[PDB]
DNA sequence: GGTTACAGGGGTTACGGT
């Protein structure tokens, strides 16, 4: 179980006679497009179907996970393509181990993305942990690979590791552009508007890329903290409706799996986009004032009172 | 080398106090 971890945590590894990369590493935003070989498990998949525009290629889309990501993340987005016919992976159920030889990574919308090479191969195993015995179904020949002994071990582990496991919290000083992160914070300020909800929140730790709140402005109802101790969060859709008249100035919140972003004028922000498709599993929820996880915040607050 | 498939998806100036 650990021999798996050990190789993964390197970022790159090898089975049979070819070299893999882990998912987390691979999610690195590479500007230059490179040739990767992947192995993980299908946390989400679409049916193969012909695409309607351009070359109109056959296309299935999948999200490969491994232990270098948290159990919350679906993982790396990969679109597989076939110009030659419908020889794409026939995926039954989640938790199927999937190897993918000869995929490319390419960044888009500030998110690293898999795109398959024309001559891509794959190999696919069942969801061993399922009661159902038919979780693999027969696969199109053209793009298979006869997998060796070692990789079939790997497959049973990944399904096990996944099955058991189905977060990592930061201070606000520790968050950087374009990441998914989780944190406790107290609310300083809110602003509803027609089109969204906004929270200004803090854990009383300075982040370079936060706005510097002046003590010297006139007629501000912000009483503190001053400088770069507060992030703005923007809640869309369901997150708006739940918080708009629920979360209030001075509440202590815990926010899970939010996405960070630099706004137009160059300050780091939090976005919770609407997420109907149960994909990102982000949350924001009130925390009881006397909780032990909140006392590090309270203490820090004395130091800026 | 990266349309198709993505989606989603979007909002003034650190106040305004809606």
PDB file of C-alpha atoms (C1' of nucleotides) in Angstrom:
ATOM      1  CA  UNK A   1       0.000   0.000   0.000  1.00  0.00           C
ATOM      2  CA  UNK A   2       2.960   2.285   0.792  1.00  0.00           C
ATOM      3  CA  UNK A   3       5.181   1.169  -2.118  1.00  0.00           C
ATOM      4  CA  UNK A   4       2.397   2.782  -4.176  1.00  0.00           C
ATOM      5  CA  UNK A   5       2.481   5.997  -2.101  1.00  0.00           C
ATOM      6  CA  UNK A   6       6.300   6.158  -2.202  1.00  0.00           C
ATOM      7  CA  UNK A   7       6.518   6.129  -6.004  1.00  0.00           C
ATOM      8  CA  UNK A   8       3.536   8.484  -6.420  1.00  0.00           C
ATOM      9  CA  UNK A   9       4.923  11.127  -3.987  1.00  0.00           C
ATOM     10  CA  UNK A  10       7.999  11.333  -6.264  1.00  0.00           C
ATOM     11  CA  UNK A  11       5.659  12.788  -8.903  1.00  0.00           C
ATOM     12  CA  UNK A  12       6.855  10.362 -11.588  1.00  0.00           C
ATOM     13  CA  UNK A  13       7.168   6.530 -11.495  1.00  0.00           C
ATOM     14  CA  UNK A  14       7.249   3.405 -13.737  1.00  0.00           C
ATOM     15  CA  UNK A  15       5.641  -0.057 -14.236  1.00  0.00           C
ATOM     16  CA  UNK A  16       6.244  -2.720 -16.905  1.00  0.00           C
ATOM     17  CA  UNK A  17       8.703  -0.668 -18.969  1.00  0.00           C
ATOM     18  CA  UNK A  18       7.161   2.830 -19.182  1.00  0.00           C
ATOM     19  CA  UNK A  19       6.994   5.936 -16.988  1.00  0.00           C
ATOM     20  CA  UNK A  20       3.872   7.378 -15.335  1.00  0.00           C
ATOM     21  CA  UNK A  21       3.102  10.702 -13.692  1.00  0.00           C
ATOM     22  CA  UNK A  22       0.765  11.131 -10.715  1.00  0.00           C
ATOM     23  CA  UNK A  23      -2.439  13.187 -11.072  1.00  0.00           C
ATOM     24  CA  UNK A  24      -1.634  15.984  -8.573  1.00  0.00           C
ATOM     25  CA  UNK A  25       1.773  16.660 -10.127  1.00  0.00           C
ATOM     26  CA  UNK A  26       0.165  16.509 -13.599  1.00  0.00           C
ATOM     27  CA  UNK A  27      -2.397  19.152 -12.588  1.00  0.00           C
ATOM     28  CA  UNK A  28       0.548  21.595 -12.527  1.00  0.00           C
ATOM     29  CA  UNK A  29      -0.139  24.386 -15.020  1.00  0.00           C
ATOM     30  CA  UNK A  30       2.433  23.646 -17.729  1.00  0.00           C
ATOM     31  CA  UNK A  31       2.477  26.345 -20.418  1.00  0.00           C
ATOM     32  CA  UNK A  32       4.230  24.052 -22.901  1.00  0.00           C
ATOM     33  CA  UNK A  33       2.297  20.932 -23.957  1.00  0.00           C
ATOM     34  CA  UNK A  34       4.020  17.590 -23.171  1.00  0.00           C
ATOM     35  CA  UNK A  35       3.458  13.835 -23.686  1.00  0.00           C
ATOM     36  CA  UNK A  36       2.278  12.032 -20.560  1.00  0.00           C
ATOM     37  CA  UNK A  37       1.410   8.468 -19.612  1.00  0.00           C
ATOM     38  CA  UNK A  38      -1.251   8.223 -16.862  1.00  0.00           C
ATOM     39  CA  UNK A  39      -2.642   5.659 -14.431  1.00  0.00           C
ATOM     40  CA  UNK A  40      -5.420   6.288 -11.908  1.00  0.00           C
ATOM     41  CA  UNK A  41      -9.133   5.690 -11.464  1.00  0.00           C
ATOM     42  CA  UNK A  42     -12.298   7.054 -13.029  1.00  0.00           C
ATOM     43  CA  UNK A  43     -13.964   9.435 -10.581  1.00  0.00           C
ATOM     44  CA  UNK A  44     -16.217  10.657 -13.439  1.00  0.00           C
ATOM     45  CA  UNK A  45     -16.984   9.683 -17.085  1.00  0.00           C
ATOM     46  CA  UNK A  46     -19.231  10.507 -20.078  1.00  0.00           C
ATOM     47  CA  UNK A  47     -20.550   8.181 -22.834  1.00  0.00           C
ATOM     48  CA  UNK A  48     -18.613   8.124 -26.077  1.00  0.00           C
ATOM     49  CA  UNK A  49     -20.507   9.882 -28.826  1.00  0.00           C
ATOM     50  CA  UNK A  50     -19.686  11.764 -32.008  1.00  0.00           C
ATOM     51  CA  UNK A  51     -18.961  15.446 -31.507  1.00  0.00           C
ATOM     52  CA  UNK A  52     -21.152  17.789 -33.582  1.00  0.00           C
ATOM     53  CA  UNK A  53     -18.620  20.329 -34.928  1.00  0.00           C
ATOM     54  CA  UNK A  54     -15.225  20.356 -36.669  1.00  0.00           C
ATOM     55  CA  UNK A  55     -13.580  16.989 -37.383  1.00  0.00           C
ATOM     56  CA  UNK A  56     -16.609  15.615 -35.456  1.00  0.00           C
ATOM     57  CA  UNK A  57     -14.428  13.053 -33.636  1.00  0.00           C
ATOM     58  CA  UNK A  58     -15.766  10.357 -31.367  1.00  0.00           C
ATOM     59  CA  UNK A  59     -15.308  11.686 -27.823  1.00  0.00           C
ATOM     60  CA  UNK A  60     -15.512  10.430 -24.239  1.00  0.00           C
ATOM     61  CA  UNK A  61     -14.496  12.661 -21.311  1.00  0.00           C
ATOM     62  CA  UNK A  62     -13.084  11.382 -18.029  1.00  0.00           C
ATOM     63  CA  UNK A  63     -11.640  12.474 -14.693  1.00  0.00           C
ATOM     64  CA  UNK A  64      -8.740  10.387 -13.438  1.00  0.00           C
ATOM     65  CA  UNK A  65      -7.994  10.405  -9.687  1.00  0.00           C
ATOM     66  CA  UNK A  66      -5.114   9.064  -7.611  1.00  0.00           C
ATOM     67  CA  UNK A  67      -3.988   9.369  -3.925  1.00  0.00           C
ATOM     68  CA  UNK A  68      -1.910  12.495  -4.623  1.00  0.00           C
ATOM     69  CA  UNK A  69      -5.241  14.339  -4.789  1.00  0.00           C
ATOM     70  CA  UNK A  70      -7.643  14.643  -1.845  1.00  0.00           C
ATOM     71  CA  UNK A  71     -10.730  12.364  -1.804  1.00  0.00           C
ATOM     72  CA  UNK A  72     -12.747  15.525  -2.542  1.00  0.00           C
ATOM     73  CA  UNK A  73     -11.203  16.387  -5.932  1.00  0.00           C
ATOM     74  CA  UNK A  74     -12.451  14.514  -9.029  1.00  0.00           C
ATOM     75  CA  UNK A  75      -8.935  14.938 -10.457  1.00  0.00           C
ATOM     76  CA  UNK A  76      -7.521  15.657 -13.952  1.00  0.00           C
ATOM     77  CA  UNK A  77      -9.932  16.389 -16.826  1.00  0.00           C
ATOM     78  CA  UNK A  78      -9.202  14.255 -19.887  1.00  0.00           C
ATOM     79  CA  UNK A  79     -10.980  14.287 -23.234  1.00  0.00           C
ATOM     80  CA  UNK A  80     -10.297  11.192 -25.328  1.00  0.00           C
ATOM     81  CA  UNK A  81     -10.774  11.408 -29.101  1.00  0.00           C
ATOM     82  CA  UNK A  82     -11.012   8.984 -32.024  1.00  0.00           C
ATOM     83  CA  UNK A  83     -11.056  10.065 -35.680  1.00  0.00           C
ATOM     84  CA  UNK A  84     -10.937   6.464 -36.861  1.00  0.00           C
ATOM     85  CA  UNK A  85     -14.150   5.112 -35.264  1.00  0.00           C
ATOM     86  CA  UNK A  86     -15.631   4.369 -31.821  1.00  0.00           C
ATOM     87  CA  UNK A  87     -12.677   2.629 -30.165  1.00  0.00           C
ATOM     88  CA  UNK A  88     -12.790   4.663 -26.943  1.00  0.00           C
ATOM     89  CA  UNK A  89     -12.785   3.201 -23.382  1.00  0.00           C
ATOM     90  CA  UNK A  90     -16.023   1.468 -22.516  1.00  0.00           C
ATOM     91  CA  UNK A  91     -16.459   2.583 -18.917  1.00  0.00           C
ATOM     92  CA  UNK A  92     -19.219   1.002 -16.794  1.00  0.00           C
ATOM     93  CA  UNK A  93     -18.880   2.478 -13.310  1.00  0.00           C
ATOM     94  CA  UNK A  94     -16.750   4.781 -11.142  1.00  0.00           C
ATOM     95  CA  UNK A  95     -13.698   3.314  -9.423  1.00  0.00           C
ATOM     96  CA  UNK A  96     -12.498   1.474 -12.532  1.00  0.00           C
ATOM     97  CA  UNK A  97      -8.678   1.729 -12.737  1.00  0.00           C
ATOM     98  CA  UNK A  98      -7.722   3.289 -16.063  1.00  0.00           C
ATOM     99  CA  UNK A  99      -4.270   3.485 -17.635  1.00  0.00           C
ATOM    100  CA  UNK A 100      -3.862   5.887 -20.561  1.00  0.00           C
ATOM    101  CA  UNK A 101      -0.728   5.690 -22.719  1.00  0.00           C
ATOM    102  CA  UNK A 102       0.161   8.730 -24.861  1.00  0.00           C
ATOM    103  CA  UNK A 103      -1.998  11.624 -23.544  1.00  0.00           C
ATOM    104  CA  UNK A 104      -1.054  15.330 -23.703  1.00  0.00           C
ATOM    105  CA  UNK A 105      -1.560  18.009 -21.010  1.00  0.00           C
ATOM    106  CA  UNK A 106      -2.643  21.501 -22.112  1.00  0.00           C
ATOM    107  CA  UNK A 107      -3.824  24.458 -19.991  1.00  0.00           C
ATOM    108  CA  UNK A 108      -7.211  26.160 -20.582  1.00  0.00           C
ATOM    109  CA  UNK A 109      -9.412  28.420 -18.382  1.00  0.00           C
ATOM    110  CA  UNK A 110      -6.418  28.305 -15.981  1.00  0.00           C
ATOM    111  CA  UNK A 111      -7.030  24.553 -15.481  1.00  0.00           C
ATOM    112  CA  UNK A 112      -4.620  21.807 -16.707  1.00  0.00           C
ATOM    113  CA  UNK A 113      -6.392  19.519 -19.183  1.00  0.00           C
ATOM    114  CA  UNK A 114      -5.782  16.106 -20.771  1.00  0.00           C
ATOM    115  CA  UNK A 115      -6.029  15.723 -24.549  1.00  0.00           C
ATOM    116  CA  UNK A 116      -5.237  12.323 -26.115  1.00  0.00           C
ATOM    117  CA  UNK A 117      -2.776  11.787 -28.962  1.00  0.00           C
ATOM    118  CA  UNK A 118      -4.159  10.386 -32.225  1.00  0.00           C
ATOM    119  CA  UNK A 119      -2.453   7.054 -31.566  1.00  0.00           C
ATOM    120  CA  UNK A 120      -3.372   6.823 -27.875  1.00  0.00           C
ATOM    121  CA  UNK A 121      -3.797   3.427 -26.206  1.00  0.00           C
ATOM    122  CA  UNK A 122      -5.419   2.550 -22.900  1.00  0.00           C
ATOM    123  CA  UNK A 123      -6.120  -0.279 -20.489  1.00  0.00           C
ATOM    124  CA  UNK A 124      -9.054  -0.568 -18.096  1.00  0.00           C
ATOM    125  CA  UNK A 125      -9.894  -2.728 -15.040  1.00  0.00           C
ATOM    126  CA  UNK A 126     -13.154  -3.419 -13.113  1.00  0.00           C
ATOM    127  CA  UNK A 127     -14.329  -1.809  -9.858  1.00  0.00           C
ATOM    128  CA  UNK A 128     -13.105  -4.759  -7.764  1.00  0.00           C
ATOM    129  CA  UNK A 129     -14.838  -3.371  -4.673  1.00  0.00           C
ATOM    130  CA  UNK A 130     -18.287  -3.634  -6.298  1.00  0.00           C
ATOM    131  CA  UNK A 131     -20.837  -6.373  -5.519  1.00  0.00           C
ATOM    132  CA  UNK A 132     -21.810  -6.437  -9.206  1.00  0.00           C
ATOM    133  CA  UNK A 133     -19.471  -8.894 -10.957  1.00  0.00           C
ATOM    134  CA  UNK A 134     -19.704  -7.377 -14.457  1.00  0.00           C
ATOM    135  CA  UNK A 135     -18.116  -3.947 -13.808  1.00  0.00           C
ATOM    136  CA  UNK A 136     -15.749  -4.474 -16.717  1.00  0.00           C
ATOM    137  CA  UNK A 137     -17.399  -4.981 -20.094  1.00  0.00           C
ATOM    138  CA  UNK A 138     -15.679  -6.009 -23.371  1.00  0.00           C
ATOM    139  CA  UNK A 139     -13.533  -3.328 -24.972  1.00  0.00           C
ATOM    140  CA  UNK A 140     -12.799  -2.256 -28.581  1.00  0.00           C
ATOM    141  CA  UNK A 141      -9.597  -3.909 -29.828  1.00  0.00           C
ATOM    142  CA  UNK A 142      -7.874  -1.084 -31.766  1.00  0.00           C
ATOM    143  CA  UNK A 143      -6.499   0.827 -28.785  1.00  0.00           C
ATOM    144  CA  UNK A 144      -6.102  -1.840 -26.036  1.00  0.00           C
ATOM    145  CA  UNK A 145      -2.764  -2.886 -24.460  1.00  0.00           C
ATOM    146  CA  UNK A 146      -1.889  -6.321 -22.997  1.00  0.00           C
ATOM    147  CA  UNK A 147      -0.949  -5.225 -19.499  1.00  0.00           C
ATOM    148  CA  UNK A 148       1.798  -7.033 -17.548  1.00  0.00           C
ATOM    149  CA  UNK A 149       1.702  -8.605 -14.079  1.00  0.00           C
ATOM    150  CA  UNK A 150       2.870  -5.581 -12.067  1.00  0.00           C
ATOM    151  CA  UNK A 151       0.194  -3.140 -13.296  1.00  0.00           C
ATOM    152  CA  UNK A 152      -2.657  -5.484 -12.344  1.00  0.00           C
ATOM    153  CA  UNK A 153      -1.368  -5.304  -8.748  1.00  0.00           C
ATOM    154  CA  UNK A 154      -1.413  -1.491  -9.009  1.00  0.00           C
ATOM    155  CA  UNK A 155      -5.051  -1.631 -10.146  1.00  0.00           C
ATOM    156  CA  UNK A 156      -6.345  -3.610  -7.126  1.00  0.00           C
ATOM    157  CA  UNK A 157      -4.585  -1.179  -4.732  1.00  0.00           C
ATOM    158  CA  UNK A 158      -5.949   1.969  -6.400  1.00  0.00           C
ATOM    159  CA  UNK A 159      -9.500   0.589  -6.185  1.00  0.00           C
ATOM    160  CA  UNK A 160      -8.922  -0.440  -2.540  1.00  0.00           C
ATOM    161  CA  UNK A 161      -7.287   2.902  -1.572  1.00  0.00           C
ATOM    162  CA  UNK A 162     -10.114   4.746  -3.340  1.00  0.00           C
ATOM    163  CA  UNK A 163     -12.826   2.580  -1.785  1.00  0.00           C
ATOM    164  CA  UNK A 164     -11.625   3.080   1.806  1.00  0.00           C
ATOM    165  CA  UNK A 165     -11.125   6.843   1.327  1.00  0.00           C
ATOM    166  CA  UNK A 166     -14.611   7.222  -0.188  1.00  0.00           C
ATOM    167  CA  UNK A 167      -9.498  17.723   3.964  1.00  0.00           C
ATOM    168  CA  UNK A 168      -6.304  19.785   4.155  1.00  0.00           C
ATOM    169  CA  UNK A 169      -6.992  23.188   5.751  1.00  0.00           C
ATOM    170  CA  UNK A 170      -4.849  26.250   5.202  1.00  0.00           C
ATOM    171  CA  UNK A 171      -4.454  29.533   6.999  1.00  0.00           C
ATOM    172  CA  UNK A 172      -5.319  32.469   4.758  1.00  0.00           C
ATOM    173  CA  UNK A 173      -1.635  33.476   4.761  1.00  0.00           C
ATOM    174  CA  UNK A 174      -0.868  30.215   2.958  1.00  0.00           C
ATOM    175  CA  UNK A 175      -3.227  30.452  -0.021  1.00  0.00           C
ATOM    176  CA  UNK A 176      -2.041  31.406  -3.524  1.00  0.00           C
ATOM    177  CA  UNK A 177      -3.595  32.138  -6.962  1.00  0.00           C
ATOM    178  CA  UNK A 178      -5.451  29.363  -8.753  1.00  0.00           C
ATOM    179  CA  UNK A 179      -5.837  26.650  -6.137  1.00  0.00           C
ATOM    180  CA  UNK A 180      -8.613  24.713  -4.437  1.00  0.00           C
ATOM    181  CA  UNK A 181      -8.329  25.234  -0.678  1.00  0.00           C
ATOM    182  CA  UNK A 182     -10.174  24.991   2.664  1.00  0.00           C
ATOM    183  CA  UNK A 183     -10.108  27.197   5.758  1.00  0.00           C
ATOM    184  CA  UNK A 184     -11.689  28.542   8.916  1.00  0.00           C
ATOM    185  CA  UNK A 185     -12.332  32.291   9.033  1.00  0.00           C
ATOM    186  CA  UNK A 186     -14.488  34.816  10.860  1.00  0.00           C
ATOM    187  CA  UNK A 187     -16.807  37.070   8.827  1.00  0.00           C
ATOM    188  CA  UNK A 188     -16.175  40.824   8.982  1.00  0.00           C
ATOM    189  CA  UNK A 189     -18.628  42.026   6.369  1.00  0.00           C
ATOM    190  CA  UNK A 190     -21.245  41.007   3.781  1.00  0.00           C
ATOM    191  CA  UNK A 191     -22.846  42.546   0.725  1.00  0.00           C
ATOM    192  CA  UNK A 192     -25.834  41.095  -1.070  1.00  0.00           C
ATOM    193  CA  UNK A 193     -26.520  42.239  -4.602  1.00  0.00           C
ATOM    194  CA  UNK A 194     -29.068  41.237  -7.265  1.00  0.00           C
ATOM    195  CA  UNK A 195     -26.544  38.934  -8.980  1.00  0.00           C
ATOM    196  CA  UNK A 196     -24.470  37.409  -6.123  1.00  0.00           C
ATOM    197  CA  UNK A 197     -23.391  37.405  -2.438  1.00  0.00           C
ATOM    198  CA  UNK A 198     -20.005  38.581  -1.067  1.00  0.00           C
ATOM    199  CA  UNK A 199     -18.234  37.759   2.205  1.00  0.00           C
ATOM    200  CA  UNK A 200     -15.154  39.527   3.579  1.00  0.00           C
ATOM    201  CA  UNK A 201     -13.542  37.053   5.939  1.00  0.00           C
ATOM    202  CA  UNK A 202     -10.331  36.739   7.961  1.00  0.00           C
ATOM    203  CA  UNK A 203      -8.327  34.388  10.180  1.00  0.00           C
ATOM    204  CA  UNK A 204      -6.088  37.306  11.245  1.00  0.00           C
ATOM    205  CA  UNK A 205      -3.079  36.229   9.157  1.00  0.00           C
ATOM    206  CA  UNK A 206      -1.605  38.558   6.486  1.00  0.00           C
ATOM    207  CA  UNK A 207      -1.559  37.550   2.814  1.00  0.00           C
ATOM    208  CA  UNK A 208       0.477  39.670   0.364  1.00  0.00           C
ATOM    209  CA  UNK A 209      -2.233  39.422  -2.308  1.00  0.00           C
ATOM    210  CA  UNK A 210      -5.126  40.622  -0.128  1.00  0.00           C
ATOM    211  CA  UNK A 211      -6.327  44.197  -0.265  1.00  0.00           C
ATOM    212  CA  UNK A 212      -4.616  46.613   2.189  1.00  0.00           C
ATOM    213  CA  UNK A 213      -7.478  48.003   4.257  1.00  0.00           C
ATOM    214  CA  UNK A 214      -6.589  51.560   5.287  1.00  0.00           C
ATOM    215  CA  UNK A 215      -7.214  52.783   8.869  1.00  0.00           C
ATOM    216  CA  UNK A 216      -7.315  56.329   7.504  1.00  0.00           C
ATOM    217  CA  UNK A 217     -10.449  56.352   5.334  1.00  0.00           C
ATOM    218  CA  UNK A 218     -13.405  58.494   6.421  1.00  0.00           C
ATOM    219  CA  UNK A 219     -16.884  57.043   6.954  1.00  0.00           C
ATOM    220  CA  UNK A 220     -16.049  53.345   6.758  1.00  0.00           C
ATOM    221  CA  UNK A 221     -18.007  50.861   8.913  1.00  0.00           C
ATOM    222  CA  UNK A 222     -15.155  48.359   8.659  1.00  0.00           C
ATOM    223  CA  UNK A 223     -13.550  48.460  12.103  1.00  0.00           C
ATOM    224  CA  UNK A 224     -10.731  45.997  11.329  1.00  0.00           C
ATOM    225  CA  UNK A 225      -8.516  44.191  10.824  1.00  0.00           C
ATOM    226  CA  UNK A 226      -6.234  46.626   8.943  1.00  0.00           C
ATOM    227  CA  UNK A 227      -3.765  45.929   6.124  1.00  0.00           C
ATOM    228  CA  UNK A 228      -3.906  42.687   4.130  1.00  0.00           C
ATOM    229  CA  UNK A 229      -5.736  40.380   6.577  1.00  0.00           C
ATOM    230  CA  UNK A 230      -9.021  39.814   4.693  1.00  0.00           C
ATOM    231  CA  UNK A 231     -10.039  37.918   1.572  1.00  0.00           C
ATOM    232  CA  UNK A 232     -13.146  38.587  -0.417  1.00  0.00           C
ATOM    233  CA  UNK A 233     -15.314  35.592  -1.276  1.00  0.00           C
ATOM    234  CA  UNK A 234     -17.924  35.508  -4.030  1.00  0.00           C
ATOM    235  CA  UNK A 235     -20.836  33.065  -3.712  1.00  0.00           C
ATOM    236  CA  UNK A 236     -22.886  32.197  -6.799  1.00  0.00           C
ATOM    237  CA  UNK A 237     -26.120  30.316  -7.259  1.00  0.00           C
ATOM    238  CA  UNK A 238     -26.927  27.837  -4.488  1.00  0.00           C
ATOM    239  CA  UNK A 239     -24.215  29.337  -2.238  1.00  0.00           C
ATOM    240  CA  UNK A 240     -25.803  32.750  -2.614  1.00  0.00           C
ATOM    241  CA  UNK A 241     -29.288  31.508  -1.747  1.00  0.00           C
ATOM    242  CA  UNK A 242     -28.099  29.604   1.315  1.00  0.00           C
ATOM    243  CA  UNK A 243     -25.966  32.379   2.800  1.00  0.00           C
ATOM    244  CA  UNK A 244     -27.656  35.629   1.695  1.00  0.00           C
ATOM    245  CA  UNK A 245     -29.832  35.767   4.809  1.00  0.00           C
ATOM    246  CA  UNK A 246     -28.025  33.223   6.995  1.00  0.00           C
ATOM    247  CA  UNK A 247     -24.314  34.109   7.321  1.00  0.00           C
ATOM    248  CA  UNK A 248     -23.835  37.413   9.131  1.00  0.00           C
ATOM    249  CA  UNK A 249     -21.084  39.838  10.204  1.00  0.00           C
ATOM    250  CA  UNK A 250     -19.134  38.157  12.984  1.00  0.00           C
ATOM    251  CA  UNK A 251     -20.084  34.530  12.335  1.00  0.00           C
ATOM    252  CA  UNK A 252     -17.263  31.986  12.312  1.00  0.00           C
ATOM    253  CA  UNK A 253     -17.314  29.964   9.084  1.00  0.00           C
ATOM    254  CA  UNK A 254     -15.517  26.940   7.719  1.00  0.00           C
ATOM    255  CA  UNK A 255     -15.136  26.881   3.935  1.00  0.00           C
ATOM    256  CA  UNK A 256     -14.259  23.697   2.081  1.00  0.00           C
ATOM    257  CA  UNK A 257     -12.823  23.231  -1.458  1.00  0.00           C
ATOM    258  CA  UNK A 258     -13.203  26.850  -2.644  1.00  0.00           C
ATOM    259  CA  UNK A 259     -11.335  28.132  -5.710  1.00  0.00           C
ATOM    260  CA  UNK A 260      -8.989  31.122  -5.484  1.00  0.00           C
ATOM    261  CA  UNK A 261      -8.594  33.743  -8.220  1.00  0.00           C
ATOM    262  CA  UNK A 262      -7.045  37.159  -8.908  1.00  0.00           C
ATOM    263  CA  UNK A 263      -9.753  39.728  -9.622  1.00  0.00           C
ATOM    264  CA  UNK A 264      -9.597  42.466 -12.284  1.00  0.00           C
ATOM    265  CA  UNK A 265      -7.500  44.808 -10.165  1.00  0.00           C
ATOM    266  CA  UNK A 266      -5.081  42.173  -8.959  1.00  0.00           C
ATOM    267  CA  UNK A 267      -6.149  41.027  -5.503  1.00  0.00           C
ATOM    268  CA  UNK A 268      -6.633  37.385  -4.587  1.00  0.00           C
ATOM    269  CA  UNK A 269     -10.247  36.312  -4.086  1.00  0.00           C
ATOM    270  CA  UNK A 270     -12.414  33.269  -3.379  1.00  0.00           C
ATOM    271  CA  UNK A 271     -15.062  32.049  -5.794  1.00  0.00           C
ATOM    272  CA  UNK A 272     -17.751  29.484  -5.113  1.00  0.00           C
ATOM    273  CA  UNK A 273     -19.270  28.906  -8.517  1.00  0.00           C
ATOM    274  CA  UNK A 274     -22.622  27.172  -8.793  1.00  0.00           C
ATOM    275  CA  UNK A 275     -22.173  23.417  -8.876  1.00  0.00           C
ATOM    276  CA  UNK A 276     -25.403  21.581  -9.782  1.00  0.00           C
ATOM    277  CA  UNK A 277     -23.426  18.521 -10.903  1.00  0.00           C
ATOM    278  CA  UNK A 278     -22.172  17.505  -7.402  1.00  0.00           C
ATOM    279  CA  UNK A 279     -18.695  17.771  -8.928  1.00  0.00           C
ATOM    280  CA  UNK A 280     -16.503  19.990  -6.725  1.00  0.00           C
ATOM    281  CA  UNK A 281     -18.153  19.200  -3.336  1.00  0.00           C
ATOM    282  CA  UNK A 282     -17.418  22.633  -1.922  1.00  0.00           C
ATOM    283  CA  UNK A 283     -19.229  23.831   1.191  1.00  0.00           C
ATOM    284  CA  UNK A 284     -19.449  26.784   3.604  1.00  0.00           C
ATOM    285  CA  UNK A 285     -20.960  26.235   7.052  1.00  0.00           C
ATOM    286  CA  UNK A 286     -21.282  28.040  10.415  1.00  0.00           C
ATOM    287  CA  UNK A 287     -19.011  26.911  13.231  1.00  0.00           C
ATOM    288  CA  UNK A 288     -20.142  27.067  16.874  1.00  0.00           C
ATOM    289  CA  UNK A 289     -18.358  29.995  18.553  1.00  0.00           C
ATOM    290  CA  UNK A 290     -16.808  27.804  21.285  1.00  0.00           C
ATOM    291  CA  UNK A 291     -15.278  25.165  18.978  1.00  0.00           C
ATOM    292  CA  UNK A 292     -11.624  24.129  19.609  1.00  0.00           C
ATOM    293  CA  UNK A 293     -10.682  24.635  15.963  1.00  0.00           C
ATOM    294  CA  UNK A 294     -11.624  28.353  16.244  1.00  0.00           C
ATOM    295  CA  UNK A 295      -9.455  29.267  19.246  1.00  0.00           C
ATOM    296  CA  UNK A 296      -6.323  29.880  17.156  1.00  0.00           C
ATOM    297  CA  UNK A 297      -8.305  32.576  15.340  1.00  0.00           C
ATOM    298  CA  UNK A 298      -9.603  34.169  18.549  1.00  0.00           C
ATOM    299  CA  UNK A 299      -6.104  34.400  20.043  1.00  0.00           C
ATOM    300  CA  UNK A 300      -4.698  36.084  16.905  1.00  0.00           C
ATOM    301  CA  UNK A 301      -7.559  38.618  17.125  1.00  0.00           C
ATOM    302  CA  UNK A 302      -6.370  39.861  20.542  1.00  0.00           C
ATOM    303  CA  UNK A 303      -3.062  40.779  18.870  1.00  0.00           C
ATOM    304  CA  UNK A 304      -4.842  43.272  16.552  1.00  0.00           C
ATOM    305  CA  UNK A 305      -7.481  44.660  18.960  1.00  0.00           C
TER     306      UNK A 305
ATOM    307  C1'  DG B   1      -0.737  19.676 -32.432  1.00  0.00           C
ATOM    308  C1'  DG B   2      -5.291  20.601 -29.841  1.00  0.00           C
ATOM    309  C1'  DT B   3     -12.114  22.803 -32.693  1.00  0.00           C
ATOM    310  C1'  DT B   4     -15.326  18.831 -31.322  1.00  0.00           C
ATOM    311  C1'  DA B   5     -15.794  18.268 -25.631  1.00  0.00           C
ATOM    312  C1'  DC B   6     -15.596  21.278 -21.724  1.00  0.00           C
ATOM    313  C1'  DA B   7     -19.878  24.340 -20.088  1.00  0.00           C
ATOM    314  C1'  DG B   8     -21.479  25.630 -16.222  1.00  0.00           C
ATOM    315  C1'  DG B   9     -19.849  30.907 -15.334  1.00  0.00           C
ATOM    316  C1'  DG B  10     -21.879  35.615 -14.474  1.00  0.00           C
ATOM    317  C1'  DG B  11     -19.738  41.206 -10.667  1.00  0.00           C
ATOM    318  C1'  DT B  12     -18.072  48.909  -8.435  1.00  0.00           C
ATOM    319  C1'  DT B  13     -13.919  50.065  -6.613  1.00  0.00           C
ATOM    320  C1'  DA B  14     -12.413  48.428  -0.408  1.00  0.00           C
ATOM    321  C1'  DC B  15     -17.207  51.935  -0.102  1.00  0.00           C
ATOM    322  C1'  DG B  16     -21.741  50.998  -0.545  1.00  0.00           C
ATOM    323  C1'  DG B  17     -24.734  49.846   4.061  1.00  0.00           C
ATOM    324  C1'  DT B  18     -28.177  48.553  -0.393  1.00  0.00           C
TER     325       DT B  18
END
